[PDB]
Amino acid sequence: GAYKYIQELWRKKQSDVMRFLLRVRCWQYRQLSALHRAPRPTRPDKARRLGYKAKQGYVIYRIRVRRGGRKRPVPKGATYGKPVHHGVNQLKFARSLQSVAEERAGRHCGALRVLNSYWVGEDSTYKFFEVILIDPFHKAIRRNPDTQWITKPVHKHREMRGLTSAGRKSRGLGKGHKFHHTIGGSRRAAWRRRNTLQLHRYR
Amino acid sequence: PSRLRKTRKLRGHVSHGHGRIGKHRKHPGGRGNAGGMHHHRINFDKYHPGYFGKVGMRHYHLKRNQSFCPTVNLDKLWTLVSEQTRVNAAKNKTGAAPIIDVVRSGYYKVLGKGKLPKQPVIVKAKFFSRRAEEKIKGVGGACVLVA
Amino acid sequence: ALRYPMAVGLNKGHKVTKNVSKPRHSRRRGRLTKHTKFVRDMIREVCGFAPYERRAMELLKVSKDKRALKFIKKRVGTHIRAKRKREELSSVLAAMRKAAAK
Amino acid sequence: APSRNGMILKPHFHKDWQRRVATWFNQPARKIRRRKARQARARRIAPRPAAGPIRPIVRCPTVRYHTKVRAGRGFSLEELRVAGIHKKVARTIGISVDPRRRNKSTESLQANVQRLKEYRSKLVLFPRKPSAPKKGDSSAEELKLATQLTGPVMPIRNVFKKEKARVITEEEKNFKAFASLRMARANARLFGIRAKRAKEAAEQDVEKKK
RNA sequence: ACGGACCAAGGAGUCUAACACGUGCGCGAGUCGGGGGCUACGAAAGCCGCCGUGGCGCAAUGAAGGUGAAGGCCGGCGGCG
RNA sequence: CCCCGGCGCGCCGGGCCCGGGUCUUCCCGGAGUCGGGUUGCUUGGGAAUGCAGCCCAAAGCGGGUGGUAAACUCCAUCUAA
RNA sequence: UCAGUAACGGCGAGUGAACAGGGAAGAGCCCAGCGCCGAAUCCCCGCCCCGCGGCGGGGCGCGGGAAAUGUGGCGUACGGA
Numbered sequence: 001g002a003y004k005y006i007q008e009l010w011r012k013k014q015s016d017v018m019r020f021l022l023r024v025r026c027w028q029y030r031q032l033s034a035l036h037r038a039p040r041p042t043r044p045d046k047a048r049r050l051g052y053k054a055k056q057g058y059v060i061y062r063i064r065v066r067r068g069g070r071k072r073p074v075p076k077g078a079t080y081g082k083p084v085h086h087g088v089n090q091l092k093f094a095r096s097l098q099s100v101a102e103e104r105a106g107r108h109c110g111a112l113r114v115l116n117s118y119w120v121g122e123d124s125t126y127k128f129f130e131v132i133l134i135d136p137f138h139k140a141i142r143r144n145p146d147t148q149w150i151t152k153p154v155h156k157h158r159e160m161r162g163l164t165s166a167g168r169k170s171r172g173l174g175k176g177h178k179f180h181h182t183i184g185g186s187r188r189a190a191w192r193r194r195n196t197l198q199l200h201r202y203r
Numbered sequence: 204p205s206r207l208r209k210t211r212k213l214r215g216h217v218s219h220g221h222g223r224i225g226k227h228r229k230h231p232g233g234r235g236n237a238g239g240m241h242h243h244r245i246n247f248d249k250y251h252p253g254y255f256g257k258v259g260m261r262h263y264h265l266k267r268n269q270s271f272c273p274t275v276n277l278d279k280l281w282t283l284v285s286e287q288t289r290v291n292a293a294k295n296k297t298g299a300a301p302i303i304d305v306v307r308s309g310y311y312k313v314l315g316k317g318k319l320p321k322q323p324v325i326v327k328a329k330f331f332s333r334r335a336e337e338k339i340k341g342v343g344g345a346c347v348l349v350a
Numbered sequence: 351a352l353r354y355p356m357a358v359g360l361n362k363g364h365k366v367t368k369n370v371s372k373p374r375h376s377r378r379r380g381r382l383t384k385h386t387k388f389v390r391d392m393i394r395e396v397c398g399f400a401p402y403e404r405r406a407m408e409l410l411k412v413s414k415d416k417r418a419l420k421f422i423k424k425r426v427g428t429h430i431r432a433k434r435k436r437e438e439l440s441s442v443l444a445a446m447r448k449a450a451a452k
Numbered sequence: 453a454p455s456r457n458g459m460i461l462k463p464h465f466h467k468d469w470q471r472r473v474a475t476w477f478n479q480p481a482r483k484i485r486r487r488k489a490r491q492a493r494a495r496r497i498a499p500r501p502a503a504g505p506i507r508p509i510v511r512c513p514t515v516r517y518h519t520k521v522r523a524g525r526g527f528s529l530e531e532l533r534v535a536g537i538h539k540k541v542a543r544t545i546g547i548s549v550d551p552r553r554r555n556k557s558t559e560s561l562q563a564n565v566q567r568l569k570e571y572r573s574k575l576v577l578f579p580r581k582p583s584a585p586k587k588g589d590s591s592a593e594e595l596k597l598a599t600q601l602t603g604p605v606m607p608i609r610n611v612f613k614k615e616k617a618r619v620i621t622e623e624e625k626n627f628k629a630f631a632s633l634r635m636a637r638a639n640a641r642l643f644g645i646r647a648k649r650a651k652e653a654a655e656q657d658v659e660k661k662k
Numbered sequence: 663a664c665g666g667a668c669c670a671a672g673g674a675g676u677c678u679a680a681c682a683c684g685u686g687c688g689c690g691a692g693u694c695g696g697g698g699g700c701u702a703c704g705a706a707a708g709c710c711g712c713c714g715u716g717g718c719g720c721a722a723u724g725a726a727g728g729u730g731a732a733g734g735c736c737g738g739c740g741g742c743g
Numbered sequence: 744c745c746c747c748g749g750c751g752c753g754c755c756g757g758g759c760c761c762g763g764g765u766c767u768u769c770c771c772g773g774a775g776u777c778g779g780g781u782u783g784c785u786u787g788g789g790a791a792u793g794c795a796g797c798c799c800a801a802a803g804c805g806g807g808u809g810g811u812a813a814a815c816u817c818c819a820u821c822u823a824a
Numbered sequence: 825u826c827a828g829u830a831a832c833g834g835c836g837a838g839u840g841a842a843c844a845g846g847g848a849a850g851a852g853c854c855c856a857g858c859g860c861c862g863a864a865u866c867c868c869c870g871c872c873c874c875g876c877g878g879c880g881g882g883g884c885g886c887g888g889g890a891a892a893u894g895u896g897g898c899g900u901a902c903g904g905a
């Protein structure tokens with residue numbers, strides 16, 4: 001039951017123990033490159049409850065993403081339009097920094113399949129995420145029925161289509177009165193349905 | 204069909220029924236309901252009083268099923284049962300009254316417009332108006348409340 | 351007197367014999383088991399308290415309870431979440447007094 | 453521009469609606485495609501009922517529809533438990549199961565339990581190996597007569613209880629439906645405030661007393 | 663005052679949606695199957711009826727809680743006188 | 744007349760050594776996530792529908808939802824990361 | 825269908841869903857965790873039999889590695905052991 005203790009310990013992120021580990025680890029992650037293959041999960045309990053298994057064909061990558069919002073990439077701040085669209089600062093990006101992290105791992109390792117990721121550190125400038133990827137051609141993966149699903153071509157670049165857990169959170173999905181925007185599967189699916197004129201033969 | 208319409212009669216007539224002076228121009232006066240508080244004010248005030256402004260409380264998440272209450276007047280009450288139901292009750296001597304269940308016919312409240320035949324009846328319903336209850340009682344009937 | 355079921359009032363509704371059954375198992379989510387309590391008490395021994403909880407406990411020592419709740423609420427966010435936290439920190443404080451007395 | 457009397461209209465044609473017009477010329481084609489798949493499915497699963505698994509009886513929510521019963525999604529685990537059908541075995545013999553659904557009242561529960569017992573009585577069960585029957589399998593004489601059923605299985609209907617005419621009693625004549633209705637609304641409306649006023653009076657009188 | 667050298671061919675109130683009124687037909691306090699289902703022309707046509715859900719109509723009024731559409735005469739009693 | 748497929752029936756070598764009910768004793772959950780403040784966008788969502796950045800930062804008969812902000816109190820309904 | 829409706833909106837112009845109800849189709853499941861099982865798990869190489877244009881089945885190696893920083897079997901909120 002060690003994973004029970006570790007999970008609870010990683011909930012005390014302002015304790016003396018955990019603050020010391022986060023601070024020194026963030027320092028160490030900061031001296032490496034923005035994309036860096038990790039030898040093992042820094043968080044074995046968090047990794048495994050996100051689908052990671054300790055077998056050949058599962059790999060970890062540590063991604064560093066710059067913190068903060070999204071500046072509008074217009075020259076000299078000119079947007080050339082109406083005042084409603086003059087904003088340059090204080091704009092936010094539609095997707096989380098964790099999702100950006102997974103996309104940067106998924107794009108680099110185009111032959112792997114991103115599964116999930118998790119938080120490992122941050123300072124004022126960077127957030128650090130470890131991404132769980134799978135090699136879809138290792139026979140430890142192809143011959144396991146419980147992981148054959150992610151070797152299918154329909155699961156190529158999940159992180160790049162908002163399919164991972166981090167990515168799908170910015171899509172406004174969910175059941176109930178809070179998520180009417182995406183009835184039909186997505187915002188555009190709801191829009192097309194609500195904006196298509198049904199002209200029946202007999203009308 | 205296009206053969207029965209004005210265009211076929213307006214061939215050779217230059218302006219096509221829109222005049223030589225005013226012509227048919229694109230959008231004089233504005234598009235749609237423009238001008239309602241302006242150059243179109245007389246039409247709106249004259250024909251659409253009340254159109255501008257706000258009145259009364261807002262209600263978020265209105266659910267029209269909660270206020271579902273179909274009504275039936277007393278003058279249509281006996282149409283909910285069969286014809287033989289009325290005549291058999293009218294001519295019988297024991298004095299048994301038939302039960303008319305308006306909820307089964309799809310109504311909830313019973314309303315008082317009309318006059319009933321001089322014939323006892325037992326009426327089941329969720330709701331009654333005051334005058335409906337008295338008219339039902341004036342013929343020797345009884346009101347029964349269901350849920 | 352004669353009484354009927356009604357669609358209005360304090361006893362409104364169609365009458366149905368209520369069936370009593372075992373509550374769905376999903377309804378015990380968040381119930382504290384003795385083992386999970388042991389693990390959480392152990393991590394408190396290893397870890398300790400966060401700075402805002404230490405500062406909140408200084409307020410409770412001097413009996414500044416109204417300011418202790420206001421400080422906690424500004425940190426956790428809600429009145430109900432703050433009330434639970436204030437009670438928990440009070441119990442910790444009271445337990446240390448007992449340990450000192452012993 | 454408005455012209456004399458008329459209605460004020462706000463057509464929703466201020467977008468590129470012609471880029472998203474859905475015609476229905478494929479409608480006959482869809483009807484033939486769906487029909488051709490119902491038949492091909494019925495042949496595949498024969499002699500199992502073409503409609504599908506038996507569905508329970510449920511009452512429609514809200515006050516507009518609670519007078520009607522219709523087919524639900526699946527039988528509740530309490531209904532299946534009372535009928536002595538294992539929940540994993542239920543689907544294998546054409547019974548639909550809904551683990552989400554609850555049973556609040558007994559009548560609805562017993563209505564669906566009798567439904568399951570009636571369906572179980574009409575079930576003709578072919579042995580897993582044709583040549584080797586087993587304990588619960590139907591006899592060969594009733595396997596010959598087995599034929600595919602069309603339409604929903606044991607269709608659900610709203611049946612009304614006819615009440616015969618009866619002599620009206622003086623107690624029903626004296627009942628005041630409207631006065632009863634109006635006073636019931638008022639009591640519900642003032643129940644909370646009345647108790648609050650009563651509680652204060654008790655405290656108000658107690659303080660003088662002691 | 664502007665266009666027009668000449669000939670041919672092409673060339674401009676349409677279609678979708680909504681509304682109003684008029685007219686024609688069907689049924690009629692009802693009416694409508696349009697979605698769905700059943701059974702070459704035919705992607706048609708026929709059917710459904712415990713497929714009428716549903717729309718509109720059959721009830722109005724109030725912001726709402728809500729309420730929601732004729733009376734008189736005769737006889738008897740109680741109260742006022 | 745060719746070929747491909749589907750559906751059936753036997754042999755060989757393997758794998759499984761498989762279930763129901765009633766009692767007794769035990770066990771049971773996803774965290775820089777929820778939640779809160781603020782900013783910007785977004786929605787019919789209006790004392791703030793969804794999303795995102797920064798700050799704060801959980802609990803365990805708890806947590807979320809219960810379409811008007813908030814305290815108290817019952818209820819209903821689910822079980823997020 | 826709800827419904828151009830609840831709602832949004834220099835409450836102007838304009839915008840605008842959901843639940844219920846009727847249908848098409850219909851299918852349900854798996855981990856982490858908590859535990860018990862001597863890691864009971866997996867990959868690759870070499871040899872023998874079978875198959876071999878979808879590279880797999882069985883047998884044998886004091887063959888190599890992965891994996892106790894956790895693989896496999898039982899089991900997942902409908903409770904489970």
Ligand SMILES: [Mg+2]
Nearest residue numbers: 093094784785
């Ligand atoms: Mg955007």
Ligand SMILES: [Mg+2]
Nearest residue numbers: 152154155163
């Ligand atoms: Mg898919």
Ligand SMILES: [Mg+2]
Nearest residue numbers: 169776777824
């Ligand atoms: Mg979130």
Ligand SMILES: [Mg+2]
Nearest residue numbers: 215216217220
């Ligand atoms: Mg002329």
Ligand SMILES: [Mg+2]
Nearest residue numbers: 219220221222
């Ligand atoms: Mg004209």
Ligand SMILES: [Mg+2]
Nearest residue numbers: 218222223226
């Ligand atoms: Mg002209």
Ligand SMILES: [Mg+2]
Nearest residue numbers: 224225226231
């Ligand atoms: Mg003019």
Ligand SMILES: [Mg+2]
Nearest residue numbers: 223224225226
């Ligand atoms: Mg002029």
Ligand SMILES: [Mg+2]
Nearest residue numbers: 227228229230
């Ligand atoms: Mg014009």
Ligand SMILES: [Mg+2]
Nearest residue numbers: 453454455456
């Ligand atoms: Mg004009």
Ligand SMILES: [Mg+2]
Nearest residue numbers: 226663664665
């Ligand atoms: Mg000129």
Ligand SMILES: [Mg+2]
Nearest residue numbers: 664665666667
């Ligand atoms: Mg000229």
Ligand SMILES: [Mg+2]
Nearest residue numbers: 683684685686
């Ligand atoms: Mg007409």
Ligand SMILES: [Mg+2]
Nearest residue numbers: 703704705706
């Ligand atoms: Mg044809």
Ligand SMILES: [Mg+2]
Nearest residue numbers: 773822823824
């Ligand atoms: Mg979960």
Ligand SMILES: [Mg+2]
Nearest residue numbers: 084085784785
């Ligand atoms: Mg924008």
